[PDB]
From a paper:
To provide the structural basis of the unique recognition pattern, we determined the cryo-EM structures of the 28-12 Fab in complex with the trimeric HAs from HK/68 H3 and WA/11 H1 at 3.7-Å- and 3.5-Å-resolutions, respectively, with imposed C3 symmetry. Overall, 28-12 appears to form more contacts with the fusion peptide and the HA1 residues adjacent to helix A in H1 than with those in H3. For H1, the D19HA2 within the fusion peptide forms hydrogen bonds with S54HCDR2, N56HCDR2, T57HCDR2, and Y112HCDR3; S299HA1 forms hydrogen bond with Y108HCDR3. Moreover, W21HA2 on the fusion peptide forms hydrophobic interactions with V109HCDR3. Another two amino acids from HA1, including V40HA1 (which is a hydrophilic amino acid N40 in H3) and L300HA1 also form hydrophobic interactions with V109 and Y108 both from HCDR3. It appears that 28-12 forms more contacts with H1 (48 contacts) than that with H3 (17 contacts). The mutations D19AHA2, W21AHA2, and V40AHA1 in H1 significantly decreased H1 HA reactivity to 28-12, while the mutations D19AHA2 and W21AHA2 in H3 did not affect H3 HA binding activity to 28-12. Collectively, these results indicate that the epitope in the fusion peptide and HA1 is indispensable for 28-12 to react with H1. The epitope dependency on the distant HA1 residues and the fusion peptide in the primary sequence probably makes the epitope in H1 HA more conformational by 28-12.
The globular head domain mediates the receptor binding process, and the HA stem leads to virus-cell membrane fusion induced by the low pH in endosomes. The representative antibody 28-12 exhibited broad neutralizing activity against both group 1 and group 2 IAV viruses in vitro and protected mice against H3N2 and H1N1 virus challenge in vivo. Our two cryo-EM structures showed that the 28-12 Fab specifically recognizes the conserved HA stem region for both H3 and H1.
Residue numbers in the entry:
A (entry chain K): 1 to 214
B (entry chain I): 1 to 229
C (entry chain G), F (entry chain B): 5 to 169
D (entry chain A): 227 to 270, 273 to 332
E (entry chain A): 10 to 115
G (entry chain E): 60 to 115
Write the structure that this text describes.
């Protein structure tokens, strides 16, 4: 198929600044290009059609132009209600290949995360599989990593993270990592720590607990 | 008004079939074109098929390879999609869309798909997996006071090994709203989802105040309440 | 060119305005063009919007009431109401008469532009028997029939077999 | 009357034309504002509200938002026009093409 | 060996026109039939110098308002120019009957 | 025929609208026609004067002021001021849209009239490869290139050498 | 705003046969009927009446 390419993957800008999101086609079209505004839980809305005009109901803050394969979506009137994922669509020929998607985020000051860690209870260890949950709140940006270390040894292949969306008021994120361990391997180890690596922290915060004091 | 209503959700085992439906009202159905655009979790939009008013020129995507069958009816104003040979990669949210037709502001003569699509619908959740329906496993987390410089604490519950997605996790049947944050579901390697939910509480009433973690699984009708202490 | 050199339109092709009817050893059927029809639709769709978007009417009234003690201004109001009506009886009925004269000429221009798209590529490789038909002097499969629609028909490449028959 | 410009009274001003050979007649016993000067006039234009200065240039049409020398069929600046003036439209571009399509 | 090709005019013009075939079409040469420019002056009409009253309106000049004393009325004009701040007209209030007819007669 | 059978105009010939590009053994360069360009300029120059000389406006005013005790006649004055404006929003914007449609058609007619001036004299003495090009099958000097521009190209006088190549 | 059987002069003056009427806070046009005879119950010469029908 005729593939599409967007750049970059995520744009972080504030209200009032200029947002430049490009979408280059692999072949020459020069007349037909679509642009959608996809929201989670809502229907997408066509913003730009043909890369020259604007759809009815769309405000005049959006703008698009280009001839050939180079096209530019210029936003000089950015509102707080427009921080969403945008997609480009080729209209000719078939198939109607959509874009990759570019998430627009609110730019603010870098904040330090608050590290929390929950020890496993007695109801989860008796079931045969226990898990330790580490919590990260009030951090920016979304690029945060959780380094699980058990008895001063880095673990891999048995952890999974879960990140929420951006906050409407604080413009922050929330992260929760879960390290899955078996019943026989839980009683062998004693120290369970959650080392946090963040851009806003000058030193890695490592919170741990005791296995016999859960 | 001009709107599209999607229906036909549920749980389909791999190797079966599923027929989707899209209702249309408030506009002429026998003059415009229709499409099928899905959205995988973690991916973007994906065009599937195209049909005309006379159902003569029918297109298919590269990911379909003739496995799907799209039909319509101009008299009943309906759009159907007979899907066959469903696998685990077909788990997406299927929508319905109408082509624009022209380049002017008001298209009085409907053309083709050369100027994108404008009308969009709500969509339905379609999940195809070989795993059966399994109730969630609720385990409470032990509270602890780790925020020394902030003087706060945290507590919550861990929900794992359930099918299908999602699970709406609340606290005190919706009464507790301060500090409640719901994490999205992440699919594990075993074929089941997992999510968490925490409540930010101060460290003054950590070892005295308790909360009830309410777990509500909507497709399986499973409601498990576990006290966190 | 309806009821002229060409007889008329067909009811088999309902997927557009213009197109071609394939007839060879591989099959047959009706097929409309996606390039020439979509461009010609935008010419007529902007023509309808040329008298709607440019007619910048305001939130006012055209009709008005008057008393019969003011028959001096009621006659001028008759020149306002029926005077604009007599212009709109003249100008608007001329627009529908002249733009449909343009549309029947532009559809005739869409005939001739599609004819010159075929005739300049099939000077000696097709027989002109009228009614928009072009019988090839060689083998022309479904890939060859789609090349004349998009305009990708090379003349010296297909003239090697048409000169023998 | 209501107090306008610290005056509780009014004064209605009237006017008429005098034909060549006609004799005007005034007769009143009070509340008459008699004229001091007269304006002898002879014609075959309207009013303009603007803040543009005056110069010794010459043109064929006048507009409040500036001088206009047309020699053009249409204009789009102001409807209140005085003289041999072009038509007023609400469009922003009515450029008549004379050459070919500019495609390199 | 020879080559005879029909040439057409093209340049770097940016003025676009409106056609029924396509909107926003750039042409090479074009005459702007819509006057969008303005000199910003009050010129004459057919050699006749107009009458400018300044801060006073017509009713301040036809009645003799005392704040419009610095004024040299010419023997002929083609139009009368008022200002947006023309409040020094009728210093005494009143109902100027048939006032709109006198603004066109003079 | 811009963005059609012909690609577009050129920036080398700035001495007129239409013309030819010479390319032979004696030299090369751009040259515009003196007969076809000057006649076609007078078509467009009289078109601009068709809406100026015929618009016999008088020494009067279009705008007028009224009092708010006369709102019965102020609504008719709105039908005089904005009513003629809505006609001028409709009629004047249609003229620029239709005469430029005529100008683009007449320039396309200036292409076809110059094409039929060449094609009727070069039926077998030139190869039609598109884009307004006509490659001769024999020797054509600068005197021969000026004969096709003025229309003084005899067919049997130059067909003796073109039939050999 | 729909006045029913009464015309504008029955509404702007307060005719008693047009009591069952709920006047909205905003409108765009006034609708009269062909049998609008229950307007001015007392006769008179409504001076400048045609300009008042366009102002409201």
């Amino acid at each position: 198929d005729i593939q599409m390419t967007q750049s970059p993957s995520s744009v972080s800008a504030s209200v009032g600044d200029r947002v430049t999101i490009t979408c280059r086609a692999s072949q020459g079209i020069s007349s037909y290009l679509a642009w959608y505004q996809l929201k989670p839980g809502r229907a997408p809305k066509l913003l730009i059609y043909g890369a020259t005009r604007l759809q009815s109901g769309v405000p005049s803050r959006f703008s698009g132009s280009g001839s050939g394969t180079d096209f530019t979506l210029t936003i000089s009137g950015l509102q707080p209600e427009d921080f969403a994922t945008y997609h480009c669509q080729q209209a000719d020929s078939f198939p109607l290949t959509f874009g990759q998607g570019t998430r627009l985020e609110i730019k603010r000051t870098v904040a330090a995360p608050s590290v929390f860690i929950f020890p496993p209870s007695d109801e989860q260890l008796k079931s045969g599989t226990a898990s330790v949950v580490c919590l990260l709140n009030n951090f920016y940006p979304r690029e945060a990593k959780v380094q699980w270390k058990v008895d001063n040894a880095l673990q891999s292949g048995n952890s999974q993270e879960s990140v929420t969306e951006q906050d409407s008021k604080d413009s922050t994120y929330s992260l929760s990592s879960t390290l899955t361990l078996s019943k026989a391997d839980y009683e062998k180890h004693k120290v369970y720590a959650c080392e946090v690596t963040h851009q806003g922290l000058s030193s890695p915060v490592t919170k741990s607990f005791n296995r016999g004091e859960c | 008004e001009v709107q599209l209503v999607e229906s036909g959700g549920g749980l389909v085992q791999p190797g079966g079939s599923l027929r989707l439906s899209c209702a249309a009202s408030g506009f002429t159905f026998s003059t415009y074109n229709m499409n099928w655009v899905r959205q995988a979790p973690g991916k973007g939009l994906e065009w599937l098929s195209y049909i005309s008013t006379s159902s003569n020129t029918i297109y298919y995507a590269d990911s379909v390879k003739g496995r799907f069958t799209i039909s319509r009816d101009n008299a009943k104003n309906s759009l159907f999609l007979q899907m066959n040979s469903l696998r685990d990669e077909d788990t997406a949210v299927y929508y319905c869309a109408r082509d624009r037709g022209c380049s002017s502001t008001n298209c009085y003569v409907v053309g083709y798909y050369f100027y994108g699509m404008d009308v969009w619908g709500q969509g339905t959740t379609v999940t195809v997996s070989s795993a059966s329906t399994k109730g969630p496993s609720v385990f409470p987390l032990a509270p602890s006071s780790k925020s020394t410089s902030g003087g706060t604490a945290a507590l919550g519950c861990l929900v794992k090994d359930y099918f299908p997605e999602p699970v709406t996790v609340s606290w005190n049947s919706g009464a507790l709203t301060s500090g409640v944050h719901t994490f999205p579901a992440v699919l594990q390697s075993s074929g089941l989802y997992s999510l968490s939910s925490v409540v930010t509480v101060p460290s003054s009433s950590l070892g005295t105040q308790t909360y009830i973690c309410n777990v509500n699984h909507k497709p399986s009708n499973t409601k498990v309440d576990k006290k966190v202490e | 060119a309806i009821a002229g050199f060409i007889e008329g339109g067909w009811t088999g092709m309902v997927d557009g305005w213009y197109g071609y009817h394939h007839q060879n050893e591989q099959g047959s059927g009706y097929a409309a063009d996606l390039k020439s029809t979509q461009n010609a639709i935008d010419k007529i769709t902007n023509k309808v919007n040329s008298v709607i978007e440019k007619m910048n009417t305001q939130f006012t009234a055209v009709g008005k009431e008057f008393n019969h003690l003011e028959k001096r201004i009621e006659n001028l109001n008759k020149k306002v109401d029926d005077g604009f009506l007599d212009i709109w009886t003249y100008n608007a009925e001329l627009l529908v008469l002249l733009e449909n004269e343009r549309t029947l000429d532009y559809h005739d221009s869409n005939v001739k532009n599609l004819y010159e798209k075929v005739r300049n590529q099939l000077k000696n490789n097709a027989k002109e028997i009228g009614n928009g038909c072009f019988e090839f002097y060689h083998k022309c499969d479904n890939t060859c029939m789609e090349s004349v629609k998009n305009g990708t028909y090379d003349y010296p490449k297909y003239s090697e077999e048409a000169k023998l028959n | 009357r209501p107090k306008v410009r610290d005056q509780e009274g009014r004064m209605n001003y009237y006017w008429t034309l005098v034909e060549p050979g006609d004799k005007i007649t005034f007769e009143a016993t009070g509340n008459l504002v008699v004229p001091r000067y007269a304006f002898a006039m002879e014609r075959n234009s309207g009013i303009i509200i603007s803040d543009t200065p005056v110069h010794d240039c010459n043109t064929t049409c006048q507009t409040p938002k500036g001088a206009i020398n047309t020699s053009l069929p249409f204009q789009n600046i102001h409807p209140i026009t005085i003289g041999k003036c072009p038509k007023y439209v609400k469009s922003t571009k009515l450029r008549l093409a004379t050459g070919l399509r500019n495609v390199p | 060996s020879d080559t005879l090709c029909i040439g057409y005019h093209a340049n770097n013009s940016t003025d676009t026109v409106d056609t029924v075939l396509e909107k926003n079409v750039t042409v090479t040469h074009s005459v702007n039939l819509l006057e969008d420019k303005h000199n910003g002056k009050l010129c004459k009409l057919r050699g006749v110098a107009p009458l400018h009253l300044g801060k006073c309106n017509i009713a301040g000049w036809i009645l003799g308002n005392p704040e419009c004393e610095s004024l040299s009325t010419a023997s002929s004009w083609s139009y009368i120019v008022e200002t947006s701040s023309s409040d020094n007209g009728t210093c005494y209030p009143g109902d100027f009957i048939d006032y709109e007819e006198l603004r066109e007669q003079l």
